[PDB]
Amino acid sequence: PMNIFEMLRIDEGLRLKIYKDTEGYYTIGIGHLLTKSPSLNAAKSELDKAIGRNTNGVITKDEAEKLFNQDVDAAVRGILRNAKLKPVYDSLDAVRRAALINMVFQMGETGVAGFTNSLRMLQQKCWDCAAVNLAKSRWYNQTPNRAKRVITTFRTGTWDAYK
Amino acid sequence: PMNIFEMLRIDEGLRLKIYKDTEGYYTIGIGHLLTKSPSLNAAKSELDKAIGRNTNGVITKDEAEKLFNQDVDAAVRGILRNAKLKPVYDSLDAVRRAALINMVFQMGETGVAGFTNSLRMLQQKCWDCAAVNLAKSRWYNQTPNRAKRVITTFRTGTWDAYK
Amino acid sequence: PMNIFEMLRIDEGLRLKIYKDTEGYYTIGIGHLLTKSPSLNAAKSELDKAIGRNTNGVITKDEAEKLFNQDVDAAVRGILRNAKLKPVYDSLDAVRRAALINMVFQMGETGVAGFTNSLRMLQQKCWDCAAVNLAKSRWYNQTPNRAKRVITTFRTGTWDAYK
Ligand SMILES: [Cl-]
Ligand SMILES: [Cl-]
Ligand SMILES: [Cl-]
Ligand SMILES: [Cl-]
Ligand SMILES: [Mg+2]
Ligand SMILES: [Mg+2]
Ligand SMILES: [Mg+2]
Ligand SMILES: [Mg+2]
Ligand SMILES: [Mg+2]
Ligand SMILES: [Mg+2]
Ligand SMILES: [Zn+2]
Ligand SMILES: [Zn+2]
Ligand SMILES: [Zn+2]
Ligand SMILES: [Zn+2]
């Protein structure tokens, strides 16, 4: 099965039980923030309310997909309120939009809006020209494995780099 | 009001009275050459004949626009006689042609014909690819403020960088 | 007269009599391998069988064109069996396919498949963007005269660089 959830499970990873992030709060699933901070009881309370069952604090893969899919909806909402990202997002097909959401989850919207020239080439359907330009970035140098997969997605509009 | 005259008033500047240029003759308006050289009476004579009124040597903004618009017509005529520039100029819309005329006023037609790769991308309607390539030039490094505005014009075909 | 034979006669050269190549066997025409190796009688035997007349070992220009045209057919067959090259080759017009065959004769299919980004831009009909990218290669630095002609062919789809 290949979709946005599986895409981020590969790029970011899955955590089926509560953990702490890099400075520094309680998290679950694919980067789902629960509370800030530092009592585990408050985070365990936020968990049960969010899923709608008994847990302390362990979930399933289907439950984690439910949390992640709500984050994507909130992310899409964010992108649509941003004048710098809305025209790109609008012009793209569903799979190329997943590559743009993947980037937003990694660096935030201010970071993604920084990819102006490449985002504009994508808008013009210059897939290959944008692929070449995206690979000449600091993002590509620092996380090349993730960046190569995201670039293939923007280039093809298929899930090929994740299969 | 936004047009080619206002565009060059911003990039090059307006002189409502006679002056001397960088080596070295009598000039008025947006770089309008009067005579070479060095008597101010000959230049003042050329002025009155060109406008069709009394002046020694001071003009209005509307009079300066008349002189400038004649230079653009002569510039367009020059571009059309050039095999290297005519195909680009022909393919462009009115606002993108103003960006190309702006470049010709800054560096001359031999200088602009030197932008071969970028001019060809413009011909293919590869706006964004040409914007990126134009920014990687010595012209961009030496006059970045003017170059950024001209590049936005080539990219959009709107007057946005001048409003 | 301008076609693929004349194109390679310019880029690689014509040999109307048997010779030895750079390590190291008997060759004729535009790089046509006869046998490996090292008896000239075996090569002279292979020659007569291939052309269908008396020779030891000297041919005409029309006979050399016959040998070369068989190599192009074998080259096209090779490209079509390659998943990395078949989609590009299919999308191109006859003259742009001749530029791609020229590259295959110079560096082989593994070498040409290495031009991924540029081949993809050609597929998208981004002629000018691919021309710029192809010129930024080691191939261009090592053989610029040949590379410039091949790049003009990919850019225009005309024989202009060879006329
Ligand atoms: Cl492209
Ligand atoms: Cl573009
Ligand atoms: Cl192009
Ligand atoms: Cl490009
Ligand atoms: Mg989506
Ligand atoms: Mg990585
Ligand atoms: Mg105009
Ligand atoms: Mg400046
Ligand atoms: Mg052919
Ligand atoms: Mg050479
Ligand atoms: Zn392109
Ligand atoms: Zn483009
Ligand atoms: Zn292009
Ligand atoms: Zn491009």
Measured between CA atoms, how close is C43 to chain B, in angstroms? 47
Q: C35 forms bridges with which residues in the sheet?
A: C26
Measured between CA atoms, how close is C11 to chain A, in angstroms? 29
Chain B interface includes A106 (CB < 8 A): no
Using alpha carbons, select from A63, A55, A53, A52 the residue that is nearest to residue A14. Answer: A63
Q: Which residue in B6, B11, B21, B62 is the catalytic one?
A: B21
Q: Is C7 helix (H, G, I), strand (E, B) or coil?
A: helix
> Could A129 and B127 be called an inter-chain contact, meaning their C-beta atoms sit closer than 8 Å?
no
CATH number among 1.10.530.40, 3.30.300.30, 2.160.10.10, 3.10.180.10, domain C1-163: 1.10.530.40
Please, which residues have CB within 8 angstroms of residue C114's CB and are 6 or more apart in sequence?
Answer: none
Cβ proximity of A155 and A127 under 8 Å: yes
Chain A interface includes B127 (CB < 8 A): yes
DSSP state of A162: G
Chain A interface includes C102 (CB < 8 A): no
- Tell me how far apart the alpha carbons of residues B138 and C65 are, in angstroms, rounded to a whole number: 47
Tokens of B53: 């009124």
Query: Which residues of C fall within a CB distance of 8 Å from A127?
Result: 120, 124
**Sign of the alpha-carbon dihedral angle for B135, B140, B145, B146:** negative
Using alpha carbons, select from C18, C15, C66, C16 the residue that is nearest to residue C38. Answer: C18
DSSP state of C23: T
> Could B126 and C126 be called an inter-chain contact, meaning their C-beta atoms sit closer than 8 Å?
yes
- State the best of A124, A125, A132 to mutate against chain B, taking most chain B CBs within 10 Å: A124
Cβ proximity of C161 and C153 under 8 Å: yes
Is residue C45 part of an annotated ligand binding site? no
Cβ proximity of B162 and B154 under 8 Å: no
Which region holds residue C108: left if phi is over 0, alpha if psi is between -120 and 50, else beta? left
> Could A155 and C120 be called an inter-chain contact, meaning their C-beta atoms sit closer than 8 Å?
yes
Buried-exposed string A33-72: b where 16+ CB fall within 10 A, e elsewhere: ebbeeeeeeebbebbeebbeeebebebeeebbbebbeebb
Ligand sitting nearest the alpha carbon of B132? 4
Is residue C33 part of an annotated ligand binding site? yes
Please, which residues have CB within 8 angstroms of residue C101's CB and are 6 or more apart in sequence?
Answer: C4, C72, C75, C76, C79
**Residues B120-124: contacts with CB under 8 Å, at least 24 apart:** B120/B88, B120/C127, B120/C128, B120/C131, B120/C155, B121/C128, B121/C129, B121/C132, B122/B88, B122/B91, B122/B92, B122/B96, B122/B154, B123/B87, B123/B88, B123/B91, B123/C128, B124/C126, B124/C127, B124/C128, B124/C129
Chain B interface includes A101 (CB < 8 A): no
What does A28-90 look like in DSSP terms, one character per residue?
ETTTEEEESSS-HHHHHHHHHHHHTS--SSB--HHHHHHHHHHHHHHHHHHHHH-TTTHHHHH
Tokens of C104: 């295959």
Q: B33 forms bridges with which residues in the sheet?
A: B27
Cβ proximity of A75 and A32 under 8 Å: no
A145 Cα: distance to centroid of ligand 6 (angstroms): 4
Ligand sitting nearest the alpha carbon of A93? 5
Tokens of B40: 């101010």
**What is the residue whose two structure tokens read 């968990």?**
A47
Using alpha carbons, select from C94, C101, C88, C106 the residue that is nearest to residue C157. Answer: C94
Q: What is the dihedral of CA B19, B21, B25, B26, to 10 degrees?
A: -20
Cβ proximity of A145 and B156 under 8 Å: no
CB contacts < 8 A, A to C, total: 22
In degrees and rounded to multiples of 5, residue A24 shows phi and psi of: 170, 90
Q: B19 forms bridges with which residues in the sheet?
A: B27
Q: What is the dihedral of CA A105, A107, A112, A118, to 10 degrees?
A: -100
Query: Which residues of C fall within a CB distance of 8 Å from A157?
Result: none
- Tell me how far apart the alpha carbons of residues A60 and C93 are, in angstroms, rounded to a whole number: 54
Is position B73 annotated as part of the catalytic site?
no
> Could A126 and B126 be called an inter-chain contact, meaning their C-beta atoms sit closer than 8 Å?
yes
Using alpha carbons, select from A59, A99, A56 the residue that is nearest to residue A75. Answer: A99
Using alpha carbons, select from A2, A6, A11, A1 the residue that is nearest to residue A105. Answer: A11
Q: In C83-137, where does DSSP find H-type helix?
A: 86-91, 94-107, 109-113, 116-123, 127-134
Burial class of residue C73 (count of CB atoms within 10 Å of its CB; 0-12, 13-18, 19+)? exposed
Q: What is the dihedral of CA B114, B150, B122, A134, to 10 degrees?
A: 100
Chain A interface includes C120 (CB < 8 A): yes
A94 Cα: distance to centroid of ligand 12 (angstroms): 21
- Tell me how far apart the alpha carbons of residues C117 and C88 are, in angstroms, rounded to a whole number: 11
The residue type of A154 is F
- Tell me how far apart the alpha carbons of residues C24 and A147 are, in angstroms, rounded to a whole number: 45
| Nearest chain B residue (CA) to A119 | B128
Could you list the active site residues of C?
A: 12, 21
Using alpha carbons, select from B14, B30, B7 the residue that is nearest to residue B158. Answer: B7
